[PDB]
Design a protein around this ligand. Structure first.
Ligand SMILES: [Zn+2]
Lengths: 62, 116, 56, 55, 50, 97, 39, 7, 212, 35, 157, 51, 217
RNA sequence: CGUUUAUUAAAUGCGUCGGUCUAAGUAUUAUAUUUAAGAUUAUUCUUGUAUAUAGAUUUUUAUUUUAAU
């Protein structure tokens, strides 16, 4: 829906996982408007860091 | 029959409607209203004028000298407001009956009456 | 005493059901709006994942 | 259950609209950033638009 | 003279009114089919003056 | 229908002649064949006179300008003494009786 | 969860059924919370 | 501007 | 917490309490006024600041009436301090049907207005006309053609003050109105009831003796 | 009185769209109009 | 909707840069993608251009409004009632013509007043003509006399 | 406090009206001792003078 | 109550204290519905003598919005049909949409008001005066206090917009003594430059006026 | 094929069908119901409710409701 519009084709390739930095920035509890993936990032290029939601910290505690 | 808001379900009465007491009466009413607007009103308030202006020129001159005032001033003592007249706002058309019917003992009882 | 609202009987009764409404009282529930709280955010939900700043 | 960036929302309210019913958040009206001041008839003309054009 | 045929000024502009009486509008008369141009045409904006 | 007596002091508007017009005893419409409209509006109307002609046009003929009009201001009898006591002894012959 | 017990009156006539309409006694000393407001 | 308009 | 409790409403007189509230504009329900300014100042003080010629002007008993609410009985002598219920009664009593008919009010026209349908005059300029209650409010007043014919409206315009008794009494029944039309037809449009207007028919020869 | 031939009806559209007794007949305000 | 870059640049260099010689920032170029928004963006940056009206008064006329007897009270704008709250809850209510309704009024500052039927205008133009008439005495001096007649009524008593 | 204040055409501020304080109706308050308002605008505060 | 046909008015009861039962309750001020009480306890003839009316306001006096001039929701005790059950009910007044033209603020304004206000408005000379002579706790409205403010401004704006006509006529009068002769149209600039009342605005404004001499003919 | 306080030809549920709705939601739709899917078929006849109705009642049966001794 963003490759089809800008390229005139079906993507016809494996889509990258790990949503691009800058997507879903207003969302707060994504977890569904995503896979259970983390909120992607800021629109930055800094190294990926898990936004330590209360959930991620619990997994560390497991 | 939009005139009287009537949908007709049975034929043979849609025919007998045009002279029905509902239609013919609604005909008279929506007509006499036209009469009032067509001829009446533009002539009724014509005469209402042609008598007032008669007064304020044929009678009020002499009347203003009776108050000892100026002529223009009396046109606010003899007509404090011009209550024109409409179909919707007539003062009683007929001065009510002066000789009222005589009361009677109740059920035509004659030597007075024990009860009411 | 449900009708402590601006009396408007033939018009639409603005807000009627919406969060910022009259005819619902003052010390009511349904006041999530008023989430504005003087206390800093971090002390009612921790500064990070481990609920650090939490407390009184 | 809200969806910010929802291409509805009137684009002023994406936080205040989580509250408000489904039936009332599309209609919530556009107002201002609450810090945007009215268009002000001040005298600052674009840097290079210049007079003759401005006049 | 100032002519006047009656049935002229309604006291309320003829948009906000029924024959006489201002009419009620309450976001329930309105459809959601307007406001659906938002999917492409973005809402009005307040461009701050530079 | 006023069971009780009361005299007002009506002040004309044309000549301000404070004339007094009383209200006698006019008996109640018969209760034997009762009529609910003619009674309960006889009574409610009676409070409206008893409170100094509250919601009624006053129609009495003047004594100074001999004519009947509807221009009277009903004076409560301590607004009357406010007026009567404050008129030179000659105008008491003019406006009062 | 709650109940006014009065039943919401029309939005035009906001008050039908005052408790006095039923010859109710609500002295502050009798049932406590009594004394009405239209008073 | 009002004093203007009189003249 | 009340810092600076206000002073009583009408405490302006030196040796008598201020009139009760409500009468001055406040809350009814209490008969006797009281002001702690007056009750604290010892008696000689209250007799110092005042001469005998003055107390007889503020002793002054306006007994039934109220000196402040002009025209209404003093609310410290009624059965209870509330306003007189009887004078200010709602227009509909507790049982009657609302058959208050259409009423036509007097308005002072301000511009020579000339109907183009009846081709005659709604009203000359500066003459009071009895117009409908919902022509006046909705068509004659919003445009500046007319105003009401109140006493003070006459004062503002330059006309001899005339008392139309504008809604001095509303009629609650058609035949209770069609009597009020008879009263108002006499005071207002009086030329209808002259010995000269009752005899336009006869200012000259009885018609049966004139030419043809 | 010679004017008592009031048509027992009137043009006014009957309020009360549904149905019932007393519809579409003269009113004592309309009976004084035609009079 | 001027969305595709090829279309926006085809309009922005011509109308907002060419015709008007305006220049839009990057973040506003985002929402500057419709005929409705192009009109407003101009109609803010051209409204912020009119030199703020310069209230400049002369001197010769200035001394008139000073010595003139009748001066203006001029504080009323504050008495006006405030409707301050969240702008959305304040403007949601004006969902329709809730403007002149229920004791509200869109007060636009008015500089001239209609004189016909305006009670509060005739209510003072007579009170003024009752001030010019009283002022006539003090001009001639019948006020001082009629005022000096009180103290001679209030002296021998 | 700024209602009915002759603006003077030198300092463009309110001239000190000595009369104003006499046509002023001190409406009370909790965070203020007694706010002064001109007489004409007194009735809008009818509840606070009753509270 | 007397039985004769024509009972001319008189000072006192002509035939002794009026007989009958309903004359017994009128002789004590009560209304003629006391004839239908089964118990007339000392509270009852208090209750029904209307010493203080059993009648209240729908909302608080402070929160009241719709302009109820002098009304309450009086309860009307009705007796039912064939089997006479007595029940009571609260009867309201009739509130109309008061869509008036208050010429103070030269625009229509709507405040819902009981019928009794739509009469006492016209008895007061306008809608605004009815807002203005009533006072606070008397006009116990809330809309009436939002529209009194605009009324108090848009009056003190007329008075302000009046003194314009007295500061303008002052200039117009005092400048005419310097528009005295049409010798120099370079001087008409200087007199206008004196009061800073520019020419380009005045010249065409007078032109539009002589055209208005031709627009009005 | 689910689901129930004395646990099931209880009551759900899909389809069809009847009625309602084009100024709050898409009339191959959603409200409001009666039935029960699948497969055959779905008969005869009307006195009342409803609809339509014409100041109302009283009258009055295209479809629907209930009825058929
Ligand atoms: Zn007289």
């Amino acid at each position: 829906h963003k490759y089809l519009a800008k390229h005139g084709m079906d993507y016809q390739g494996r889509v990258p996982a790990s949503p691009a930095p800058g997507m879903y920035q207003g969302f707060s509890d994504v977890h569904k408007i995503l896979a259970n993936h983390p909120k992607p990032q800021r629109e930055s290029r800094h190294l990926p860091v898990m936004p330590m939601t209360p959930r991620v910290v619990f997994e560390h505690a497991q | 029959c939009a005139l009287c808001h009537i949908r007709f379900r049975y034929k043979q009465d849609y025919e007998a409607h045009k002279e029905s007491e509902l239609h013919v009466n609604r005909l008279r009413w929506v007509e006499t209203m036209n009469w009032w607007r067509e001829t009446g009103e533009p002539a009724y308030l014509k005469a209402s004028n042609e008598q007032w202006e008669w007064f304020e020129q044929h009678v009020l001159p002499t009347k203003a000298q009776e108050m000892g005032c100026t002529l223009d001033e009396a046109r606010r003592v003899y007509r404090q407001a011009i209550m024109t007249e409409t179909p919707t706002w007539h003062r009683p058309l007929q001065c009510p009956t002066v000789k009222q019917e005589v009361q009677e003992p109740r059920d035509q009882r004659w030597p007075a009456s024990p009860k009411w | 005493v449900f009708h402590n609202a601006p009396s408007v009987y033939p018009f639409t009764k603005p807000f009627h059901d919406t969060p910022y409404d009259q005819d619902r009282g003052r010390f009511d529930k349904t006041k999530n709006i008023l989430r504005e709280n003087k206390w800093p955010a971090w002390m009612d939900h921790g500064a990070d994942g481990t609920g650090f700043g939490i407390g009184l | 259950r809200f969806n910010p960036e929802g291409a509805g929302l009137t684009r002023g309210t994406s936080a205040y609209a989580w509250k408000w019913w489904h039936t009332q958040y599309p209609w919530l009206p556009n107002v201002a950033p609450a810090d945007y001041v009215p268009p002000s008839p001040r005298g600052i003309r674009p840097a290079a638009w210049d007079d003759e054009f401005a006049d | 003279v100032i002519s006047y045929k009656a049935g002229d000024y309604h006291l309320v502009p003829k948009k906000f009114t029924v024959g006489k009486r201002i009419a009620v509008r309450s976001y329930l008369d309105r459809n959601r089919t307007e406001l659906s141009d938002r999917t492409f045409m973005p809402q009005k904006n307040w461009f701050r003056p530079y | 229908s006023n069971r009780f007596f009361q005299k007002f002091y009506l002040r004309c508007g044309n000549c301000s002649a404070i004339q007094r017009s009383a209200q006698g005893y006019q008996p109640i419409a018969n209760p034997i064949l009762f009529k609910s409209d003619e009674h309960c509006r006889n009574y409610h109307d009676e409070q409206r006179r008893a409170a100094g002609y509250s919601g009624m046009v006053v129609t009495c003929r003047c004594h100074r300008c001999e004519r009947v009009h509807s221009n009277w201001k009903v004076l409560d009898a301590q607004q009357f003494l406010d007026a009567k006591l404050r008129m030179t002894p000659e105008e008491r012959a003019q406006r009062l009786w | 969860a709650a109940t006014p017990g009065v039943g919401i009156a029309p939005e035009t006539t906001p008050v039908k059924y005052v408790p006095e309409m039923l010859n109710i006694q609500n002295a502050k000393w009798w049932n406590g919370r009594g004394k009405p407001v239209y008073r | 501007v009002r004093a203007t308009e009189k003249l | 917490v009340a810092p600076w409790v206000p002073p009583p409403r009408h405490d302006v007189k030196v040796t008598m309490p201020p009139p009760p509230g409500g009468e001055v504009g406040g809350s009814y329900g209490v008969s006797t006024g009281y002001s702690d300014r007056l009750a604290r100042t010892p008696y000689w003080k209250r007799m110092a600041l005042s001469t005998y010629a003055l107390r007889m002007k503020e002793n002054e008993t306006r007994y039934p009436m109220s000196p402040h609410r002009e025209g209404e009985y003093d609310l410290r002598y009624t059965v209870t301090a509330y306003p007189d219920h009887i004078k200010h009664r709602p227009l509909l009593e507790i049982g009657e049907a609302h058959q208050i008919p259409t009423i036509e009010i007097p308005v002072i026209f301000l511009v020579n207005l000339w109907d183009e349908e009846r081709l005659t005059w709604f009203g000359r300029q500066y003459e009071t006309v009895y117009v409908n209650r919902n022509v006046a409010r909705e068509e004659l007043l919003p445009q500046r053609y007319a105003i009401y014919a109140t006493e003070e409206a006459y004062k503002l315009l330059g006309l001899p003050v005339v008392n139309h008794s504008i809604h001095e009494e509303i009629p609650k029944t058609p035949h209770a109105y069609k009597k009020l039309l008879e009263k108002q037809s006499y005071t207002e449009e009086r030329w209808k009831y002259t010995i000269e207007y009752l005899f336009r028919k006869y200012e000259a020869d009885p018609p049966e003796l004139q030419d043809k | 009185e010679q004017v008592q031939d009031v048509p027992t009806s009137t043009d006014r559209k009957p309020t009360g769209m549904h149905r019932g007794p007393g519809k579409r007949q003269t009113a004592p305000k309309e009976a004084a109009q035609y009079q | 909707v001027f969305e595709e870059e090829t279309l926006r640049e085809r309009v922005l260099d011509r109308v907002v840069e060419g015709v008007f010689r305006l220049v839009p920032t990057s973040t506003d170029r985002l929402e500057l993608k419709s005929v409705a928004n192009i009109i407003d963006f101009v109609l803010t940056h051209v409204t912020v251009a009119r030199k703020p009206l310069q209230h400049e008064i002369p001197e010769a006329a200035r001394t008139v409004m000073r010595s003139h007897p009748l001066q203006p009270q001029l504080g009323f704008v504050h008495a006006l009632p405030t409707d301050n709250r969240d702008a959305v809850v304040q403007e949601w209510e004006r969902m329709h013509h809730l403007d002149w309704q229920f004791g509200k009024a869109v007060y636009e500052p008015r500089s001239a007043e209609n004189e016909r039927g305006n009670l509060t205008w005739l209510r003072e133009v007579r009170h003024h003509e009752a001030r010019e008439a009283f002022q006539a005495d003090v001009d001639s001096g019948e006020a001082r006399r009629r005022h000096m007649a009180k103290i001679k009524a209030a002296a021998q008593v | 406090v700024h209602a009915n204040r002759y603006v003077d055409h030198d300092t463009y501020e309110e001239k000190y009206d000595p009369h104003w304080e006499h046509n002023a109706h001190l409406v009370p308050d909790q965070q203020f001792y007694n706010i002064p308002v001109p007489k004409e605008y007194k009735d809008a505060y009818w509840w606070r003078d009753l509270q | 109550f007397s039985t004769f046909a024509l009972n001319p008015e008189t000072s006192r009861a002509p035939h002794g204290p009026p007989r009958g039962l309903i004359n017994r309750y009128i002789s004590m001020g009560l209304p003629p519905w006391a004839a239908w009480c089964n118990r007339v306890n000392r509270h009852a003839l208090y209750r029904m003598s209307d010493v203080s009316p059993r009648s209240f306001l729908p909302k608080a006096p402070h929160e009241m919005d719709v302009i109820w001039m002098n009304e309450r929701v009086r309860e009307r005790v009705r007796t039912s049909r064939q089997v006479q059950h007595v029940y009571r009910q609260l009867k309201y007044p009739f509130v109309k949409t008061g869509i008036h033209y208050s010429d103070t603020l030269d625009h229509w304004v709507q405040v819902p008001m009981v019928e009794a206000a739509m009469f006492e408005i016209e008895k007061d000379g306008g809608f605004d005066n009815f807002i203005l002579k009533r006072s606070g706790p008397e006009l116990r409205s809330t809309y009436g206090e939002r529209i009194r403010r605009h009324l108090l401004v848009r009056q003190k704006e007329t008075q302000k917009n009046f003194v314009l006509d007295q500061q303008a006529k002052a200039l117009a009068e005092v400048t005419q003594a310097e528009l005295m002769k049409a010798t120099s149209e370079e001087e008409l600039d200087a007199v206008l430059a004196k009061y800073g009342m520019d020419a380009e605005e005045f010249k065409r404004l007078m032109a539009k006026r002589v055209m208005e001499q031709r627009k009005s003919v």
